[model samples]
Target: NPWTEYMAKYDIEEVHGSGIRVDLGEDAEVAGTQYRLPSGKCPVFGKGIIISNTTFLTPVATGFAFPPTEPLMSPMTLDEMRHFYKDNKYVKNLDELTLCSRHAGNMIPDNDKNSNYKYPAVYDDKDKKCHILYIAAQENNMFCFRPAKDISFQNYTYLSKNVVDNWEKVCPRKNLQNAKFGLWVDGNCEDIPHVNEFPAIDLFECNKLVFELSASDQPKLTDYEKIKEGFKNYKSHGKGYNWGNYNTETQKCEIFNVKPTCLINNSSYIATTALSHPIEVE
Candidate 1:
């Protein structure tokens, strides 16, 4: 069956306790508990206890230590994690990929108060080397915008092609960089004006945009190239600025009026924008 072949690669181990006891030598006192060295090793636990001078001896327990007696091991790197599940068929499907925070097993909460955005996951396809996607904060929204050709305004800068080409390297996981679009939230939503009648505002007044990856339309290498081309052939016509509606069938941009609204539920494609910033972890 389709589901039978797609089961998890490994089984999770059963846990019994909320903490582990480590013998950090007789002199060291930890959490009001005194741990002593083993009286001649008999039965050993997983990986056994390191008897070296630098390493501490760990007693077998049902649970792991809280606040950890020792420094926690570094989380798996992107390449390391990818290689670990290279053979799994579930990983083959983009939808099956899990977005993780800095720490493993810690779930990002659903609350709006915290900045839930984490590191972007990279998917490598036969045609594309790195397909990157990231999470957005609950308060922000994402959308796509086409750049205008032959237009330059003070304090307004276009997203550079160089940044897009090497986005994975240039943009840190902590910060959403190389953003080109900005959005303004109208103070008076009740008196919302038509898209055509939207007024031009200063760049500093608008919020910077960021983007999230979409599984519905996974961007290809060619799509990124097309975005670069759009940057080269940039738009704004006189007093009216041009927004674009991408025609999926013809693969071209159709000029449309700038819609002054937040598209919270919109599906993101290439040349997309969203509100993002650096998230604090700790």
Candidate 2:
């Protein structure tokens, strides 16, 4: 609430604050990042917190004023709103909506390692589209923490009526390694014979692409921006590099050539191909 004091004094210059559309911090400055993938690991990344500064457009806040139709704070627990829904039969079926207050974003339960102090979830009965969230505990440690969809499912699926906690068994697939090449064909295997076929599986080029980001490579890029951009440039060309999540709390960068995509927020980066997956070819 003390923010009111500051807003009262310095907020008059702004037209108003809102989501969907709000602009202000574009010219402030910019920070950089680095990302990478391991020889056999899935992928990895980090952010550059100590940037000169940059304008940032954060997500709209999720909280807002609302009537206590259901229980306050908790959702769906009260019967008052349910009675209203029944009284009106609620317009078109699509007009119906459900809410919850137990989606845990980064609020992993300390008391129970498996449990977390967060919301249950939001789901659509028709489409079956699931909504889950998790946020980072620290600004620099990790990006607003949203666990992998599978990980989140593993943790909270207990709440599901069916409890489908085994994500891996549901979707089984192998990620390729830089040193590997093979295809899962009709219960058999096939090695891509041509470079073009590689593209189908996303082998841009077997050309041994390695990044050397040591103090040995470019000594002048000691400045953070230059170094950050250096790796980014590599990613732009489908080649990955390192130096992601580079804050004093978590400072690191690297030398590699796996095109990195800015993912998991600015907290980290990962191989474009790693998350890319694959498409079948006849």
Candidate 3:
């Protein structure tokens, strides 16, 4: 929670021009991978603006920035998929971290790279359009991206309008957007004041929130080696073990060891989820 204040500090920087390239900062490493922003077709674009999508808007968008880039696959509907690059194709920076799926897909399976899902901001070189200029990463972590070409605020506006329209139609989440940062101001989005205040937010806050959220929101990091070893050793006769289960008494997910049960009446009730693999945090 302490990290939530960085946004209250230094704000994100922006620039506008044609043929000017963006500085993705020096290469840094986190969670064991080297990440760098990739260059686009045009090498530069026009009127590039910087913004943050932290909060609820961030969730429905690009799930998380880091390794668990999996959640991104589920939240988006087919129509919104239009903004993405098709399968087997990925933006430069995110290509290296592929692994098993975590959202709405299989788990426990070792080979799951083709589920290499991500949200890369696409720059339309021919038309000078920007799709997903900035997207949220784990927690409040956000990144500013630009495709090669002259991208201007005018061109980006068209992208924004189309996205807003799509979001409203596909799934109305204006209420969630409003609760964000209280930045929506009485939910007043009719005019200038609402728009003016958002840019004032700092990138620091966004970074802090992302890590903080990752700590709290993401599933607890399990000792995969231990679990896998235990799974291998622990036998359940013909009845197999499950990844997780639900305790009817607590009515919450049972995130640990489990047991299979016999049915009484027509139902043997204990919630269990076995879709994800054990290599997540290992």
Candidate 4:
């Protein structure tokens, strides 16, 4: 696809950071049933970062951005999830997004918050040592997160290795469940690229494709700016790459327009993707 250029080895620092502190973003709207957020603990040891898993917040659209979520959407591992999020009408922006780390652990809405699921970037203040971070929503979508630091680049393939367990444990997804979902796009089983020993959410055994339309020799989308704007017009924000869609309804491809985008998949491990027409319109 267009981003084949920037798809190669990128560091955690390339697309990582944290925003300022604000309230939980949602003030109790209900008469009294509205949940009151409890006080947060200071950064653990002043070095650990606070991160939350976005599995609950973003669910499927994990790449769209809100100044924070924007930077994390790339590589397109969770495309259908983005579509699911869009279909669910959960994409929202707020002035008081909560700040949480895995340690914060389901303070609101019972145990609905995802504590684990470390991403490539560390977006917490407490877990500074953690190079990897996982984020999620705490009530509606306001979130807090912590980073997984004690790992090396060589071994921390997906979501900082151990940190992903935090995510996996918090919000579990089984291939059996994933298997129930039918095919969404055009692609083959081998079409998906695999991450070492990792299996698909449905346990159907997935090999995720790199998503870059491989050329005989070179790649595309080298410019980060061009890459960032890859998804500018979309139905949602801060999650999922709207690389346009095949739009069975429209019969043509429908592209997504979030700055940081995640491509949807054809199957469990098979990611269905398309590149933009390299040239411009008349």
Best by TM-score: 3
TM-score comparison, 1 vs 4, better candidate: 1
RMSD of each: 23.8, 20.7, 22.2, 19.8
TM-score of 2: 0.19
| Model 1 misplacement above 4 A | 1-74, 92-272, 275-282
**Regions of candidate 2 where Cα sits further than 4 Å from its true position:** 1-73, 77-81, 91-144, 151-282
**Better TM-score candidate (3, 4):** 3
- The segments of candidate 4 whose C-alpha lies over 4 angstroms from its true place after superposition are 1-166, 169-174, 177-180, 183-206, 210-282
Candidate 3's residue-wise lDDT over 151-186, tens digit each? 122121111111111221221111111111211224
Q: Judged by lDDT against the true structure, how good is candidate 3?
A: 0.22
Best by lDDT: 3
Clashes of each: 8, 32, 21, 67
lDDT score, residue 150, model 2?
Answer: 25
- Evaluate residue 90 in candidate 2 and report its C-alpha lDDT on the 0 to 100 scale: 31
**Candidate 4: worst 10 consecutive residues by lDDT?**
209-218
For candidate 3, give the lDDT of residue 30.
27
Report the CA-based lDDT of candidate 4 relative to the real structure.
Answer: 0.21
By lDDT, is 2 or 3 better?
A: 3
List the global CA lDDT of all models. 0.20, 0.20, 0.22, 0.21
